[PDB]
Amino acid sequence: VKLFRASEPILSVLMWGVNHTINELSNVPVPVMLMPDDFKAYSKIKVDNHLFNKENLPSRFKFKEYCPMVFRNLRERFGIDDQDYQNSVTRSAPINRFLTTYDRRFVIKTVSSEDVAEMHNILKKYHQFIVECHGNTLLPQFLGMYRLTVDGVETYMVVMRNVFSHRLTVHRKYDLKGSVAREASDKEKAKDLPTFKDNDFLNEGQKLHVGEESKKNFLEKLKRDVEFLAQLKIMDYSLLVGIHDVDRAEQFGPGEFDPSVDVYAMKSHESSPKKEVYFMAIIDILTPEQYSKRFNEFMSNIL
Amino acid sequence: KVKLFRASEPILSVLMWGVNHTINELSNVPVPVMLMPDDFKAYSKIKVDNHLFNKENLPSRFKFKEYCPMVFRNLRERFGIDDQDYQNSVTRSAPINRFLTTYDRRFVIKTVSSEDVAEMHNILKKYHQFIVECHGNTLLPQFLGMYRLTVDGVETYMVVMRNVFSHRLTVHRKYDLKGSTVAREASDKEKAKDLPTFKDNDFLNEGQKLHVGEESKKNFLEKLKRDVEFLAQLKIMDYSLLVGIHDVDRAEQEEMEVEERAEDGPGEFDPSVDVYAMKSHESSPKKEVYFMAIIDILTVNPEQYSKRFNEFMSNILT
Ligand SMILES: Nc1nc2c(ncn2[C@@H]2O[C@H](COP(=O)(O)O)[C@@H](O)[C@H]2O)c(=O)[nH]1
Ligand SMILES: Nc1nc2c(ncn2[C@@H]2O[C@H](COP(=O)(O)O)[C@@H](O)[C@H]2O)c(=O)[nH]1
Numbered sequence: 038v039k040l041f042r043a044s045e046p047i048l049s050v051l052m053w054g055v056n057h058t059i060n061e062l063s064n065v066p067v068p069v070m071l072m073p074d075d076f077k078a079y080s081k082i083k084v085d086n087h088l089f090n091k092e093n094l095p096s097r098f099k100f101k102e103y104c105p106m107v108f109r110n111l112r113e114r115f116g117i118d119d120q121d122y123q124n125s126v127t128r129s130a131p132i133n134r135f136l137t138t139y140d141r142r143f144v145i146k147t148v149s150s151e152d153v154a155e156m157h158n159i160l161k162k163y164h165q166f167i168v169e170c171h172g173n174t175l176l177p178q179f180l181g182m183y184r185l186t187v188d189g190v191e192t193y194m195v196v197m198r199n200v201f202s203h204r205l206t207v208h209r210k211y212d213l214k215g216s217v218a219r220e221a222s223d224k225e226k227a228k229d230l231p232t233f234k235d236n237d238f239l240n241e242g243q244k245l246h247v248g249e250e251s252k253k254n255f256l257e258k259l260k261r262d263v264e265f266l267a268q269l270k271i272m273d274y275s276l277l278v279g280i281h282d283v284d285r286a287e288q289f290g291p292g293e294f295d296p297s298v299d300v301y302a303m304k305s306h307e308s309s310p311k312k313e314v315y316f317m318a319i320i321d322i323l324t325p326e327q328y329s330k331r332f333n334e335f336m337s338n339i340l
Numbered sequence: 341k342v343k344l345f346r347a348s349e350p351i352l353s354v355l356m357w358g359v360n361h362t363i364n365e366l367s368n369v370p371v372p373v374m375l376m377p378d379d380f381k382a383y384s385k386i387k388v389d390n391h392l393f394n395k396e397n398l399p400s401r402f403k404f405k406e407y408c409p410m411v412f413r414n415l416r417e418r419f420g421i422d423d424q425d426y427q428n429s430v431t432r433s434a435p436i437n438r439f440l441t442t443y444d445r446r447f448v449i450k451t452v453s454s455e456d457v458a459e460m461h462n463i464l465k466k467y468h469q470f471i472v473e474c475h476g477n478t479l480l481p482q483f484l485g486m487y488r489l490t491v492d493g494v495e496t497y498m499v500v501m502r503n504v505f506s507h508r509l510t511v512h513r514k515y516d517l518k519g520s521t522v523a524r525e526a527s528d529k530e531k532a533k534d535l536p537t538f539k540d541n542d543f544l545n546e547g548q549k550l551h552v553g554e555e556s557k558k559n560f561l562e563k564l565k566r567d568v569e570f571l572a573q574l575k576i577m578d579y580s581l582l583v584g585i586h587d588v589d590r591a592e593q594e595e596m597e598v599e600e601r602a603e604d605g606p607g608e609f610d611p612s613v614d615v616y617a618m619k620s621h622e623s624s625p626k627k628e629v630y631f632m633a634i635i636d637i638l639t640v641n642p643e644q645y646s647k648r649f650n651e652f653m654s655n656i657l658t
């Protein structure tokens with residue numbers, strides 16, 4: 038029994054919406070291949086309830102899903118069961134725009150009209166790339182795209198796999214581009230979880246010890262990714278890096294995690310100083326050669 | 341577990357889609373302690389525009405309206421119908437025949453007019469009360485859902501009710517009885533149909549009689565009494581008693597000829613399912629099952645119509 042109780046009616050519509058579309062899809066046969074029209078397709082539902090079911094939900098609202106067959110396919114290729122996706126969004130209000138499902142597995146990002154256009158723009162190629170690389174990639178994993186209409190207002194959302202662990206705490210965040218010079222602001226430098234940048238990183242001497250095992254895979258991955266982003270003539274994307282300090286945690290065991298769920302996590306190396314878990318993925322790709330090449334190096338340095 | 345809502349006509353796919361949709365939604369809605377007055381003016385309305393998506397069985401564009409859903413859910417409960425069952429009966433496979441039956445013959449789906457839906461609203465509060473205080477024991481139509489479908493910009497109203505007839509037992513003869521003083525008979529056109537709808541004068545001509553025996557006759561006549569009086573209270577007129585007769589032996593042979601043909605439990609029913617069914621008196625000639633319900637509830641005035649109706653239906657059985 039799902040009430041879709043959330044701190045805000047937008048979020049209730051979202052939960053209602055994700056629940057409705059996933060159910061709907063469960064009655065849609067899984068096709069032998071995606072078709073070009075699936076890339077221009079959408080489900081639209083308009084709800085108008087008179088004197089009924091008002092407790093958590095608005096009486097009137099619209100919910101639109103973009104390209105449901107493509108995103109259902111992406112979920113699969115990313116190793117994600119539709120029923121778990123649904124459960125993550127609906128069992129409980131997502132929490133604090135940049136939201137997270139209650140179980141921290143999926144990030145829910147508000148985006149713009151042009152963003153959604155940019156997405157349509159790259160979606161066939163992005164899909165094809167996901168196929169070719171068998172789901173293994175540092176790129177953002179796009180799970181669903183949606184427009185909500187509440188109180189006459191439209192709101193676009195993209196749902197992604199969370200870069201960070203969902204049960205492990207992060208002690209560092211470093212947004213990295215590799216160019217110029219970027220730093221953390223005074224105002225921000227004193228927040229609980231500071232979003233440091235390139236220079237703040239190098240001026241700390243911070244390195245990441247994953248061995249040459251993990252580094253070989255990671256770098257091979259990184260280049261094919263940024264090459265793809267470049268071939269798409271895209272840029273200004275960062276490498277989000279999270280650092281979890283095991284020991285500090287002690288102040289179901291520490292450092293323990295499920296690689297199939299925390300897809301970006303990486304164990305520290307034997308021959309390494311402190312014991313930690315790193316999280317590394319490419320974020321912010323919705324907007325060339327020079328940027329890629331550079332970003333590729335700067336990243337291959339800290340490691 | 342996939343449901344395609346495959347059907348001969350888009351309207352039917354939409355119906356299946358809608359009952360399925362509204363039942364799931366209702367499942368995330370607490371069962372109230374009691375119904376509230378707004379519940380009697382409530383409705384749900386969904387509007388779908390699919391673009392290049394999910395077009396095999398459903399239209400791309402349609403609307404589904406459920407009237408007073410909280411009331412009808414509660415009605416289903418008081419008639420001992422589980423929502424899952426109802427949903428399955430409607431959605432597992434297309435209704436068949438406007439007048440439809442669920443593929444499993446448990447429920448009837450009648451296409452009705454805007455006026456009908458209006459009349460349903462007029463009487464809905466009192467009907468519910470009357471169903472509460474007779475504990476669901478009535479010859480009246482038992483209403484389970486009311487819907488408006490929209491396909492190709494055309495509106496279609498439907499009411500879902502329980503089948504007057506058994507869902508297993510075959511009917512071999514049926515009558516529509518009113519008791520009117522006017523003449524009422526089966527047309528020449530009708531008589532040549534497979535299962536003709538005979539009328540008042542045909543039933544009398546045939547010397548027909550229904551042998552239910554005294555304990556059942558009383559329980560029936562007591563239902564009829566409050567039912568018609570209730571209908572009388574409301575402005576209601578010109579409803580009929582639907583009478584279906586099932587011949588036990590004839591069915592046994594028909595079954596027999598059904599196997600032999602393919603080659604190339606004894607006149608009983610569940611009274612919690614076949615709610616209008618009565619066995620024949622243990623002293624009847626032929627062994628029989630009857631089904632008897634009032635239908636169509638949406639000079640002579642209602643009170644006198646009821647009175648007429650009553651005395652006739654009372655002389656129909658023995
Ligand atoms: N916990 C978490 N934070 C993220 C993730 N992706 C991006 N972020 C953070 O959320 C912020 C909001 O997005 P942005 O400000 O870059 O538009 C980002 O700057 C980044 O610090 C993620 O997957 N998990
Ligand atoms: N008495 C009553 N009639 C209604 C109500 N809602 C719809 N109707 C009637 O039912 C028919 C169809 O209404 P519609 O739902 O198509 O607007 C019309 O005759 C309309 O007046 C209601 O809440 N109360």
Ligand SMILES: Nc1nc2c(ncn2[C@@H]2O[C@H](COP(=O)(O)O)[C@@H](O)[C@H]2O)c(=O)[nH]1
Pocket residue numbers: 458459462
């Ligand atoms: N659509 C709609 N129609 C109504 C509603 N209330 C009444 N009607 C229609 O208006 C007629 C007159 O209302 P009444 O005088 O019987 O209360 C009803 O028989 C019904 O057809 C309503 O709330 N919604």
Ligand SMILES: Nc1nc2c(ncn2[C@@H]2O[C@H](COP(=O)(O)O)[C@@H](O)[C@H]2O)c(=O)[nH]1
Pocket residue numbers: 438439448450502503504505514537582635
């Ligand atoms: N099997 C079955 N037939 C019904 C039921 N109610 C009405 N009918 C049939 O529907 C017709 C009467 O309603 P009509 O659709 O003409 O208004 C008659 O042919 C009658 O036999 C029912 O509950 N079950």
Ligand SMILES: Nc1nc2c(ncn2[C@@H]2O[C@H](COP(=O)(O)O)[C@@H](O)[C@H]2O)c(=O)[nH]1
Pocket residue numbers: 593597
């Ligand atoms: N009443 C009755 N009729 C039968 C029986 N067996 C066959 N008949 C009838 O006799 C005719 C021949 O049936 P058949 O033997 O060809 O199936 C058919 O009309 C069939 O309905 C039976 O056991 N009882």
